[PDB]
Amino acid sequence: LSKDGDLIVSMRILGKKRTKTWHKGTLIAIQTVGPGKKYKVKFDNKGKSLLSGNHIAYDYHPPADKLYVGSRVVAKYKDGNQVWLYAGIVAETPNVKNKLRFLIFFDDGYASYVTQSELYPICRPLKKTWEDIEDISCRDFIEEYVTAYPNRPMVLLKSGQLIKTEWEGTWWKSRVEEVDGSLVRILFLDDKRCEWIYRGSTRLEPMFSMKT
Numbered sequence: 001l002s003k004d005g006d007l008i009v010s011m012r013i014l015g016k017k018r019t020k021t022w023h024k025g026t027l028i029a030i031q032t033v034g035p036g037k038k039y040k041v042k043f044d045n046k047g048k049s050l051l052s053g054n055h056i057a058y059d060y061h062p063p064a065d066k067l068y069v070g071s072r073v074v075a076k077y078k079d080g081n082q083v084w085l086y087a088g089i090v091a092e093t094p095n096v097k098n099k100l101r102f103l104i105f106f107d108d109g110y111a112s113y114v115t116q117s118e119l120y121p122i123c124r125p126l127k128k129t130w131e132d133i134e135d136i137s138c139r140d141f142i143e144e145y146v147t148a149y150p151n152r153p154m155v156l157l158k159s160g161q162l163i164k165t166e167w168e169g170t171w172w173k174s175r176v177e178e179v180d181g182s183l184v185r186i187l188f189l190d191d192k193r194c195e196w197i198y199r200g201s202t203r204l205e206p207m208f209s210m211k212t
């Protein structure tokens with residue numbers, strides 16, 4: 001093949017690497033294989049990979065208003081001063097309470113708000129968009145969140161409040177530092193990490209009680 005719909009050899013594309021981060025590259029081949037197609041990408045760092053349609057993204061931000069809770073996307077994370085692209089799911093479309101940003105649940109647990117300009121859309125997502133999440137606890141969470149929506153039990157926390165927050169199987173004295181839309185910044189008080197957590201997460205002691 002040389003076309004699959006709007007996918008046409010030589011164009012620019014994002015591809016997913018074995019490290020789970022995505023990188024710009026050029027689509028250099030399209031080959032029917034099996035019931036589907038596979039998509040050969042030559043990355044800018046000279047490398048190459050043969051990716052299924054759900055592991056390439058288009059080099060252009062989605063028209064908001066085509067995006068929705070469930071939408072499969074790729075988004076920027078800001079590792080200190082590094083910047084990585086990581087695949088995720090849209091948990092909130094923009095509105096007043098979240099200061100008109102998108103809440104992205106990443107494939108790997110984490111959550112953060114972003115903007116139309118920090119989002120790339122995945123080319124051929126599964127129908128049930130979460131079925132390609134490799135981590136199971138996240139595949140099930142996202143399934144239940146998207147299906148239930150607009151039901152979203154969260155706890156309300158105020159800046160200053162003290163709570164227990166789970167971390168590697170143990171519950172840590174911690175403190176709430178800041179709240180932003182559907183996320184809170186917890187400070188674990190023994191070892192001094194901060195962490196953003198979705199306020200409906202069960203790592204939060206209140207939410208863990210509410211939910212048993």
Ligand SMILES: C=CCn1c(N[C@@H]2C[C@H](c3ccc(OCc4ccccc4)cc3)CN(C)C2)nc2cc[nH]c2c1=O
Nearest residue numbers: 019020021077079084086106107108109110194195196
């Ligand atoms: C404050 C944020 C830290 N953080 C994070 N970060 C992760 C970082 C993840 C990542 C990013 C870049 C990577 O590639 C580097 C590289 C790897 C191998 C070879 C070569 C290069 C690899 C992994 C991406 N997801 C989005 C967030 N996840 C969670 C979850 C609960 N809590 C937190 C938290 O606190």
